[PDB]
Amino acid sequence: RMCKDLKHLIYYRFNTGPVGKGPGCGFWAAGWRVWLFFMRGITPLLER
RNA sequence: ACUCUGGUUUCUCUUCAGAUCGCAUAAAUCUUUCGCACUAAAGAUUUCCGUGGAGAGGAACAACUCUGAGUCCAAUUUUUUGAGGCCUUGCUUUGGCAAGGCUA
């Protein structure tokens, strides 16, 4: 849900101006952060 | 204005760290609370991601910038003079002292 949140955060700043709707936005650092912080927590679970 | 420290980088270990150890943020478990728990909150513990400090060990090139330490004044106002000489008493430790008056 959080990554979708960040998509809504990023796209609606990305798709302003002459940029319209479309699949061209990639500012991937926010979601990539979120999934790495998930990997931080489940690394010792899957390791155990 | 002459001389002796201390370096910096990197790899690793050990210990302390409730300090935004992290200008970022996970997960598990337990307990509590209400719902009726991914869509929910509290408290606590733990594990992870991965820090600062100190100590130690290796190995790479810099070695005295830095942090330190050991290492030109005679004219009013101070350090280039108002300084020296005479008289009375108390005692003379008979050398003279103390006070006052002087004279320059």
Ligand SMILES: O=P(O)(O)O[C@H]1[C@H](OP(=O)(O)O)[C@@H](OP(=O)(O)O)[C@H](OP(=O)(O)O)[C@@H](OP(=O)(O)O)[C@H]1OP(=O)(O)O
């Ligand atoms: O917000 P979501 O439910 O996750 O859906 C979004 C949304 O589509 P909808 O508006 O129809 O809901 C975006 O559109 P806008 O928010 O801009 O209006 C669209 O982005 P673009 O239209 O700008 O391309 C995006 O597509 P994507 O994330 O693939 O870029 C799409 O996500 P979905 O792929 O899940 O439909």
